[PDB]
Amino acid sequence: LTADQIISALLEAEPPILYSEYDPSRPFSEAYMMGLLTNLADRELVHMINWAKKVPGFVDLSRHDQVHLLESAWLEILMIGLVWRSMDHPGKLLFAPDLLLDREQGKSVEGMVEIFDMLLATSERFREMKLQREEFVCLKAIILLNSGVYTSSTLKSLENKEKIHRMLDKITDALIWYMAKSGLSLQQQHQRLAQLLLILSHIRHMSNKGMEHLYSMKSKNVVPSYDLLLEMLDAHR
Amino acid sequence: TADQIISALLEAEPPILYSEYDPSRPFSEAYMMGLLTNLADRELVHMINWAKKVPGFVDLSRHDQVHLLESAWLEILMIGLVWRSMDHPGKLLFAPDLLLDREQGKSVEGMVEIFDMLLATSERFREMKLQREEFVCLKAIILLNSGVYTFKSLENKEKIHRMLDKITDALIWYMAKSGLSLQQQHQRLAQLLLILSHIRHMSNKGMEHLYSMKSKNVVPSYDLLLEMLDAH
Ligand SMILES: O=C(c1ccc(OCCN2CCCCC2)cc1)c1c(-c2ccc(O)cc2)sc2cc(O)ccc12
Ligand SMILES: O=C(c1ccc(OCCN2CCCCC2)cc1)c1c(-c2ccc(O)cc2)sc2cc(O)ccc12
Ligand SMILES: [Cl-]
Ligand SMILES: [Cl-]
Ligand SMILES: [Cl-]
């Protein structure tokens, strides 16, 4: 696929924006807020699997590798979507069209304000850089494919590792091509590519801190089970 | 210029320290962790000297310098370890007198996971034939980027961004001087910056492993780093 075909496929695969089912009449307790966020994330996961299967090349990886990438990336992907939705809302996190939250609301849950501040800082960075939808979808696909923890290896794992490397190179090419099509100088192209890929290190950090936080709130039932992900991947929706 | 950035970073490389490993002592976990702790402690002093040689870093306020060092110090130690280890497949070269394999990492509770990640990162660097010029650029990028999204202030942030961009320019310049095509330049740049996200992951998991370990002086406290910045 040429660079435009990759971007076109990713744009067409964008998931829908879901609502939190927020009810203004309910007391807005910590448990109520976290319950809304939990059910929202759970409903977003199904759409994330559908999106992943449309990432060029993803379904040509082994089903094991598909699951493993989703297991590693799912919170990063939720977070970058949040940051994108919040770009045009300084100081706010737009979890859903009916759930806009600020720092002060995060303070009510121990450990949440620190992560809110990191998410807000990323949204500010995206706003300042005027991140384009074409760049966002490339970054989200890179997150999915780069998520696997470094690792005992078999011919199958090496085969999929090389495929993932080739896919990442093509998305890099597409990100650069979009910038060139948009008129950026060669010097601006490498600087902006570097700045955008460096933000992915911050999103990784936020995901790690977020996982720590979820485990301190819920003992178990925090990560999607392997069987759950495989079930959703195999569905012929 | 780009050549001046690369030459400056090469000249700023810290010395390779020894662990003081004594083969005659019983290699208890306490003895090993002690060697690694004191080694890291001694490396930190040289990391401060090096940081002040990263172009632009001296022009930042003490508060900003401390914040960046606070966020980056373990990643910087780890990328150094990975670099020293890429001539030793299957081993981590903490120091020339302390070369450890995966088995020796099992002695520490919860360390084999981090060990394997570091080993795999060293293999990645070996496969890519990472050059010293690229390595020093990556270390400088880690220093200027790890803490920039956790911070007048708006101008200070943009100032650090410009400092980063000058290192990116130098890293691409080196690749262009080495003969890579434009496509290979952008591909290799992306490959290296994506490895940095994994080194960030390793640092985060190492931090969780150090705090949970109850280790003494897990992090260089703010006041500690603040005082070391005034040594020179
Ligand atoms: O609040 C959440 C969140 C809540 C519950 C989650 O997991 C619920 C458990 N569920 C188990 C089955 C598999 C899917 C996860 C995940 C994110 C979100 C985030 C978060 C923010 C700060 C913080 O300290 C921790 C998390 S970021 C985010 C983006 C979304 O699109 C949805 C929820 C969220
Ligand atoms: O063993 C260590 C290590 C041990 C103690 C440390 O903290 C020491 C105390 N702290 C140091 C900074 C000043 C404040 C005191 C840091 C690294 C090293 C690493 C490590 C690996 C896996 C893991 O799970 C945790 C750490 S990586 C590394 C590279 C080095 O050059 C030296 C030590 C190391
Ligand atoms: Cl020494
Ligand atoms: Cl010394
Ligand atoms: Cl090269």
Residue numbers in the entry:
A (entry chain B): 310 to 460, 463 to 548
B (entry chain A): 311 to 461, 467 to 547
The authors write:
Human estrogen receptor alpha (hERα) belongs to the family of nuclear receptors (NRs). While agonist binding promotes the interaction of the LBD with coregulatory proteins, such as for example the interaction of hERα with the steroid receptor coactivator-2 (SRC-2) protein, binding of antagonists leads to a rearrangement of so-called helix 12 (H12), and this rearrangement precludes any further interaction with coregulators. Here, we show that the application of PROSS server algorithms to the ligand-binding domain of human estrogen receptor alpha (hERα) enabled the development of variant ERPRS* that comprises 24 amino acid substitutions and exhibits multiple improved characteristics. Crystal structures reveal several salient features, i.e. the introduction of a tyrosine corner in a helix-loop-helix segment and the formation of a novel surface salt bridge network possibly explaining the enhanced thermal stability.
These variants are identical to ERPRS*, but contain one or two additional AA exchanges that have been shown to improve the crystallization behavior of hERα when crystallized with small molecule agonists (in case of ERPRS*(+)) or antagonists (ERPRS*(−)). The conformation of the LBD is stabilized in either the canonical active (ERPRS*(+)) or inactive (ERPRS*(−)) conformation in these two variants, thereby considerably improving their crystallization behavior. The structure of ERPRS*(−) was solved in complex with the antagonist raloxifene at a resolution of 1.6 Å. The crystal structures clearly demonstrate that the ligand-triggered switching between the active and inactive conformation of hERα is fully preserved in ERPRS*. The affinity and thermodynamic characteristics of the interaction between ERPRS* and its native agonist estrogen as well as to the phytoestrogen genistein remain unaltered by the 24 substitutions. This also extends to the structural binding characteristics of the antagonist raloxifene and to the resulting inhibition of coactivator binding. Moreover, no detectable coactivator-binding affinity is observed upon binding of the antagonist raloxifene.
